[model samples]
Target: MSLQDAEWYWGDISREEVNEKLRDTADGTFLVRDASTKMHGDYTLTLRKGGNNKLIKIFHRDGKYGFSDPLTFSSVVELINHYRNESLAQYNPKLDVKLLYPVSKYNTQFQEKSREYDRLYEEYTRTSQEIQMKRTAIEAFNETIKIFEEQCQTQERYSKEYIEKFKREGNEKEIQRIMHNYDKLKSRISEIIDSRRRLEEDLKKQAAEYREIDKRMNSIKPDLIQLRKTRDQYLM
Candidate 1:
C-alpha cells in the first residue's frame, strides 16, 4: 500500500520515505513537528544500526535530546509505526488541529476559561428546564386558585342566606346543618390557599435558581467571546 501523509501523531516521514532514505545509508534523520505537546516545536529522529540491528533516538529542537533504551525490530516500517503509535501518540489532539495550543503564559487562562464556559452551559440548560416546570406548576396553581375562588363565592352567598333564615326561624337543627355546610366550605378554601402558598414557594425557589444560572452565563459571555477571538489570533 502507498504510504499516506504523516499525521500529527506520526512523524513527517512515511514508511516508503524512510526506506528510501535509509536504504543506502546506515543513519538518517526524519524531522517531525511536535504539534501535540505543549512545547509545539520540531522533533528530529535519528535512525541508525546498533548491536547488529537498527535503532532510533529522539531529539527535540528545544535543546533536549534522548536515546531509546532498546528496540525489538529496527526496520523502517517498525520504527515509523512505533514512533507514531508510542513515541508521540500522547500529543495527538484526537480532534482538530485548531484546538492545539503551544505552552505559554496564556495557556492557563485559556484552560480555565474553557472549563468555565462548559460548566455554565451545562448548568444553564438544566436550570432553564427546571424553571420551565416551575412555571407550569405556577399556571396550574393559579387556575386552581381561580376555581376555588368561584366555588367559595358561590358557597358564601348561600351561607349568608342560610344565616339570615336561621335567625328568623330559630330552628336549632336547621342552624346546625347550615353551620356545618359553611365550615366545610371554609375548610376547602383554606386547603386550596395553603396548597397555593406551597406552590408559590416552589416557584420562587426554582425561579431564583434559574436567575442565578443566567447570571453566571451572562457573566461569562464576554470573556468566552474574547477567549475565542484570542484563540483565533493565536492560530493565525
Candidate 2:
C-alpha cells in the first residue's frame, strides 16, 4: 500500500538506494531505452503479497503496460526465478530491474518478534518489582518477630523464672501484645515467601522468552542481506 509497508530491492541495494543510483542515470529515472528507436518512456514493476502467491505486474511509459496477465509465485526467490527464465531474460536483455514488494514479509516477522521482546521485558520488570516488594515485607516481618523474641528472653532472664510466670504476673499486657505481633508477622512472612517464589519463577520464564526473541531478531539480519543482493539484470 505504502512505501513503509513495502520493501524494494535491487540485488543487495535497498529500493531507496536503487532509486538514488538511477536517479540521474541516462534520464531522470530508471529507464529501459529501445536502442533501435532511441526513444524512452517510464517502466515500472510492482509486486503484491497474496495468499500463497506473489502478484506481479509490469508497466511501460507509452500509456501502455505489459505483463497484464496475473503472475503469482510463492516466494521472492521463486518470483525472481520466474522473471529471469520467462520474462526479463528474453525481452529485456540489458535492463536492470528493481524488485518491489507491497509488504515485506521479513519485516512483518521482525515487528512481531520485536513486540514480543517488549512484552517480555515489561513482564520481567514487573515480576522483579513484585519479588523485591515481597522480600522487603518479609524482612520487616522478621525484624518485628526478632524484637518480640528478644523481649520474651529478657523478661525470663531478669525474672529468673519461666516467661509464662512473667506473662501471667507482672507483664500480662506486654506479653499479650508481643504474642499478637509475633503471630501476625509470621503469617505475613509465610505469605510473602510464597509470593516471592511465584514471582521468581515468572521472571525466569520471561527472561528466557526475551532472550529467544532477541536471537530470532539477530537471525533476520543476515537473511535480509542475502535477499537484498538478489537481482535480475536484463535489457530490452
Candidate 3:
C-alpha cells in the first residue's frame, strides 16, 4: 500500500521537472514525490493552483505518514485516498486546495502487461524449485538401484556357494532359505528402477513447461523496456 505502487507517485523524478510540469496546470492536478531536499526520506505533495506549483511536505516518522502530525496515515495510499475529495480546508483555507487528479506514473495499458509478467515469473521460479527437488529424488533412486545391483553380484555368489554346501550335506532347509532371501532382496531393485523412471519423466515434462514460462518472460522484456522508456510522456 505504499505510494510507490500508486499512479500518482513519482519517486525518482527531478524537482525541476515536477515544478515545471505543474507550473501551469489545473487547480487540482497533483502528485506525490520524494522531496527534492534530503528531508529524512519525507515526501512532497506537489499541487497545482494559482498558475504554479505549491510544494507541501508529507512527513513519515515512526511508521506513520501525512502532510501534518500526528502523522496519522499507516499508508501513503490511504492518505491520498482521504485528501483527493476532501478540501485541504484546515491546513490552508484561502487556497482551498484538493488533490483532484493524480498524474499517472505509467500508462495503464503497459501496466497490464507488467502484471502478467509478474504472474509468469512467479510460476517460473516455482517450477524451477519443483524440478530441483525431483532431480534429487531421482538421483537417490538411482543410488538405490546401484546399491541393489552391487548386492546382486555379492548375494548371488554367496547364495550359490551356500546352496551347494547345504545340498552336499543333504540339508534342504538351509539351501531353500538362502535362495529365498537372495530373490526377495533382488526383487526390489526392479521396483526402484521403475520409480526412478517415473521421476525422470515428470522432470522432463516440468522442465518443458518451465522453459515455456521462461521464454514468455524473455519475450516480455523488450516490451517492458520500451514502455518504461515512454513513461516520461505520462509525467509530462
Model 2 bad stretches (over 4 Å): 1-173, 231-236
| lDDT scores in order | 0.55, 0.47, 0.76
Best by lDDT: 3
Query: How well is each residue in 1-236 modelled by candidate 1, as lDDT tens digits?
Result: 11234432344444443343343433223333233333443344433333121323343333333333343443333445555345343444331112121111225777788898898888888877877787788788788779878877887787787778777986788878867987997798788789878878877887787787788878877887677667655863
- Could you estimate the TM-score for every candidate? 0.44, 0.32, 0.50
lDDT of 2 by residue, 1-236 (tens): 32232244322233443333342223212212112222442223332212112223343333443553333333333444455344343554543333332222223544555566566567666766766676676567567667766976786588655656666677778788878977896687677667656766766676676666556656755554444333322110
Residue 59 local lDDT, model 1 = 32
Compared to the true structure, candidate 3 yields what TM-score? 0.50
Candidate 1 vs candidate 3: which has greater lDDT? Answer: 3
Candidate 1: what lDDT?
0.55
- Per-prediction CA RMSD (Å): 15.1, 16.7, 15.3
The ten-residue window of minimal lDDT in model 2 covers 27-36
Error of 2 at 61 (Å): 44
**Candidates sorted by TM-score, best first:** 3, 1, 2
